[PDB]
Design a protein around this ligand. Structure first.
Ligand SMILES: *Cc1c(C)c(=O)n2c(=O)c(C)c(C)n12
Ligand SMILES: *Cc1c(C)c(=O)n2c(=O)c(C)c(C)n12
Ligand SMILES: *Cc1c(C)c(=O)n2c(=O)c(C)c(C)n12
Ligand SMILES: *Cc1c(C)c(=O)n2c(=O)c(C)c(C)n12
Lengths: 171, 171, 171, 171
């Protein structure tokens, strides 16, 4: 038997423990087109049709964006774009209204409600019109059989849509 | 009715989705004492007794370290230190053995097994002894009624102990 | 050395593995009062005020219901009831409208929107009025600093309100 | 305007909230073979070789058992059996020892340690030998690239092996 004294400089009293953390993935699409028909006399949308190129997704991260295009997500080879088609605008007042339309994600279609909030209807620098408005609503991955392989535990069933639009008059 | 064209520079087609991520919290204790009795003729530990100052915890983060000291964790005001007491060393060979001892965390005591691996028994620069060895094992938060408020979902029930020791002879 | 043959009847080749499962807690309150003012000529709510006795909660389970009353939840000793007060009814059509009001849970108050759907406005068996309607909306635990100790991982931040009402005319 | 009184018998003040729950999946294999060589004079295992038919899995549930056989798990069509091969038995005392061996799951092989505990070495009713012993240890899904599609969040990375054996002498 013999007696020792730790050399504290090269000794290490250590532990490891696993925990979970919840976080929001935020992201946009860099490339989309839309058609916007709006009557400032009555503050009613007449036609709103959007097409979004799935390929142009951006969640501030290279390898996750790529991964979004694969079979377990968007299948962008087979279904290159997602689309929104307004079917009904129900006015609340001049600042607010309830938009119903058809969303299509990878060829599956469902009718959704978005909350229209008019941010401000003006006549621009040049005397030609502008508008600023937002569309907000929650959709369920499950309603579109989207990412069915990924559990509703790992990644939430709810997707929050925030569409913020500024827009100018035509011709 | 009127027609508009998005100004893409001040338009934003966006989404938010919540996901979980699993991660390891790694950490040591900066301040501890020990008593080490070891026989290099037979590669057997004779006595090993450790005291660790809960206060000296370090998980590379200021606010979590503080939080560790509160009631939902260590209760460091009432129970300032955790202790380990060897009761039995069962030799496997000269490099390996099974250590049984009493761990006490916030006044609750349980007997644990650590896996002793001898990293190397030498005579130093000056002809006085050194040893290098490690102690490894898993303990359960639940066995010590530790952090009982925190679910075994958020933070894992299993804690992995890695004690890495270098140490020199005495007097 | 010697050779053996398993007795398969008293041998057992076994394993244990931990998994997570997500589930909905559904529940009502058995005891509440309300005041309901409604104009069938215009299908508009005029006043809607509800008080709910936290004590009367029922989620088909004895020990969880009790647990709901404690500090980590409702604090029913100090705050025996939750209340809803309509501030605005914005009509969509005769079947649909957007209700804004003040919800108070354990003394914290926030303004919420419920989705009013009129299930049917009739004159009853006796020639005195009836109505059937529903109120639906999502509120956030976090907006009411509710159950702050419980993580948004274990128990979801979102609570879904489904109020289904049948109701008869007065005096 | 008009006044109403809830009919409480057909009114319902309700809510839904999502929570997580952790649970152990326990299970065995109904069909396996083994070869057991053991020396009661020295209480040492000499050879232990096990083959388990993946097909014979039982976790008290029909549809999960089927699901275990598919690509995201066992791939039982391609890899019908898992195997264990002892390489080393290191004796602790007569009741305890450390077993090292090769586990193969769907064609991937890793060396594991099991904790041998001898439950009792006897001579049976007829004067021919019996033994009762257990093998216990934790293996990591990740070490065997097992169920790689399933996250370590949903289903734990750690699998706990409990092998309980009774066994009689040969010829
Ligand atoms: C002791 C110590 C410090 C300072 C550190 O950063 N870490 C770790 O990451 C571990 C695992 C240990 C122990 N330590
Ligand atoms: C469009 C876009 C970019 C480039 C970005 O970083 N983020 C976000 O964080 C959100 C929520 C959105 C939309 N975008
Ligand atoms: C073998 C077996 C059966 C049939 C069963 O129900 N269970 C369990 O619950 C475990 C842990 C094991 C092994 N088995
Ligand atoms: C009011 C009530 C009872 C008694 C019940 O079982 N449930 C549910 O499951 C819901 C969703 C509600 C409301 N209630």
């Amino acid at each position: 038997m013999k007696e020792y004294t730790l050399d504290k400089a090269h000794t290490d009293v250590g532990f490891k423990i696993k925990h979970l953390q919840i976080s929001n993935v935020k992201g946009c699409f860099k490339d989309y087109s839309a058609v916007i028909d709006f009557d400032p006399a009555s503050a009613e949308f007449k036609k709103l049709d959007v097409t979004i190129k799935i390929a142009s997704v951006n969640t501030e991260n290279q390898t996750r964006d790529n991964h979004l295009q694969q079979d377990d997500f968007f299948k962008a080879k087979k279904y290159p774009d997602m689309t929104f088609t307004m079917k009904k605008y129900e006015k609340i007042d001049n600042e607010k209204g309830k938009m119903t339309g058809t969303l299509t994600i990878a060829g599956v279609s469902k009718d959704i409600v978005l909350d229209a909030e008019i941010g401000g209807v003006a006549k621009g620098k040049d005397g030609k019109e502008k508008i600023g408005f937002s569309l907000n609503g929650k959709i369920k991955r499950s309603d579109f059989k989207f990412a069915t392989s990924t559990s509703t535990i790992t990644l939430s069933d709810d997707i929050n849509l925030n569409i913020e639009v500024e827009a100018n008059e035509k011709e």
